[PDB]
Amino acid sequence: ALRAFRSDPGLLTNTMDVFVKEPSFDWKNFEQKMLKKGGSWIQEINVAEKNWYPRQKICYAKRKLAGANPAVITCDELLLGHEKAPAFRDYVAVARGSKDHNIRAQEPESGLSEETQVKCLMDQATDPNILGRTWEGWEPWM
């Protein structure tokens, strides 16, 4: 499926861009649907009015479809919404690699190929520590 995807002129790219540039949900409807139901989002926003900036989202999606190690992409996505975090380097070290427990740490960071990409994704897909710690509503024990 992924090999048949990423040999395309990019109709999916610009279609995704004109989805995300719709003047409906530019942080307003997202904060609406956040405050509606449960979770832990209640308050403490202050930077969420910025960082939306759809060149970020389309650039990251175009990189993660045009050849990208899926630990680098989730690193950028984790940093740009959680810079100056009180617990940050522990997060990025746990979800970065170990050089002896994962194959994703032992790989180049861009310009990859398809079988390598899906292999390191399936390696990224499971860990007794990543799945070992998440929010218990997601129920990782099953």
Binding site: S7, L11, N14, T15, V18, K36, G111
Partner: protein
């Protein structure tokens, strides 16, 4: 046709290639083109000549698109091949490559469905050129061939609509009347999947380029314009510029033209008057805390929220005047007589912004003695006795 199919295998072959091997696997095809499939027969037929122009242009664009992430180290083992590179300072050959691509791709549009390729390839090539520029006659050239393709029945031009939506706003000076003069003659049912863009187009600037086709869709297929319009005129403000004056005219005209049966609004009211009202209670409480806790300079917005808060679940005959009453708001407002007494009286302009705890205990007791599944259809008894009657241009779900 043999050399054409071989170049097709080349382009699809380079599509799964790595990085440096791309230029190598296409230059041999270029040298095959340097031999004779140039030898004075692609003028007896113009169509295969045009496909030859398209394949030559996309070959040059693949050569140029190769060294986008690789500056000049790829051009390493090249002496006679470097001579052929320089035949037709790291920039002065790349721009010549792109310009030769523009030339041998514009020759195609200078020359069914043997022309949809020539239009669409030049369209996407100048599209990615403008996508390079945002990081000449580009909007003057994309819209011409794109709408010439969209006039014929196609999928790819139909999926190339919102790029035109953004290129018109981004380039207002680049032949704004041209897309109007081309949108004047299109079969106006190749927009219905995109029409939720066009309905919220008009409340912003420059609706005057496209109102012909919106008028035609509201004439011909009036059901397929309805549900975007309720939302896109629910929150629709206006500005008082000279061309902006007739925009409220045209939207009031289309507003008066639609719902001409005057029954779609009653259908929507019937569907609205069945839901959980305590859901609307927490909705009103949370989204008044979202707007009153910062500062109460919300000009008329507190009373505007109170308009909905009173229209749905207020005094129990206000739904009898706005719509037809249900069999459960006659329970709800009847128990909620004292709940909306001080509610409708002192909840207009109190500006308290902190207290909802008596509201909390009344909403939690409101969930106690109720069956909000109404157990029949008479929980909203407009629809239980439908029995469609006469000629009123029926609903068509």
């Amino acid at each position: 046709s043999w050399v054409q199919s071989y170049c097709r295998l080349s382009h699809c072959r380079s599509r799964s290639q790595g990085c440096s091997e791309q230029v190598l696997t296409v230059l041999k095809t270029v040298s095959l083109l340097d031999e004779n499939n140039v030898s004075s027969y692609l003028s007896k037929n113009i169509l295969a000549f045009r496909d030859q122009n398209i394949l030559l242009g996309t070959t040059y664009r693949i050569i140029a698109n190769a060294l986008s992430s690789e500056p000049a180290c790829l051009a390493e083992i090249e002496e006679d091949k470097a001579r052929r590179i320089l035949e037709l300072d790291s920039e002065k050959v790349i721009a010549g490559l792109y310009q030769r691509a523009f030339q041998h791709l514009s020759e195609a549009v200078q020359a069914a469905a043997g022309v949809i390729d020539a239009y669409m390839t030049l369209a996407d090539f100048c599209d990615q050129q403008l996508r390079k520029e945002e990081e000449q006659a580009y909007p003057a050239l994309v819209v011409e061939k794109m709408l010439k393709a969209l006039k014929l029945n196609s999928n790819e031009a139909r999926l190339k609509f919102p790029r035109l939506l953004q290129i018109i706003e981004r380039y207002p000076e680049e032949t704004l009347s041209l897309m109007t003069k081309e949108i004047s003659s299109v079969p106006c049912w190749q927009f219905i999947s995109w029409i939720s863009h066009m309905v919220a187009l008009l409340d912003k600037d420059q609706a005057v380029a496209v109102q012909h086709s919106v008028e035609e869709i509201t004439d011909n297929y009036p059901q397929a314009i309805v549900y975007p319009f309720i939302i896109s005129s629910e929150s629709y403000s206006f500005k008082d510029t000279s061309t902006g004056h007739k925009n409220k005219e045209f939207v009031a005209r289309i507003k008066s033209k639609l719902d001409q049966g005057g029954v779609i609004q009653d259908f929507i009211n019937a569907l609205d008057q069945l839901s959980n009202p305590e859901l609307l209670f927490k909705d009103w409480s949370n989204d008044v805390r979202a707007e009153l806790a910062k500062t109460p300079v919300n000009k008329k917005n507190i009373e505007k929220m109170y308009e909905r808060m009173y229209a749905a679940l207020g005094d129990p005959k206000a739904p009898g005047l706005g719509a037809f009453r249900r069999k459960f708001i006659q329970t709800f407002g009847k128990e909620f007589d004292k709940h909306f007494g001080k509610g409708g009286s002192k909840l207009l302009r109190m500006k308290l912004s902190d207290f909802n705890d008596i509201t909390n205990m009344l909403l939690l007791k409101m969930n106690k003695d109720s069956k909000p599944p109404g157990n029949l259809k008479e929980c909203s008894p407009w629809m239980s006795d439908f029995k469609v009657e006469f000629l009123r241009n029926e609903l068509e779900i």
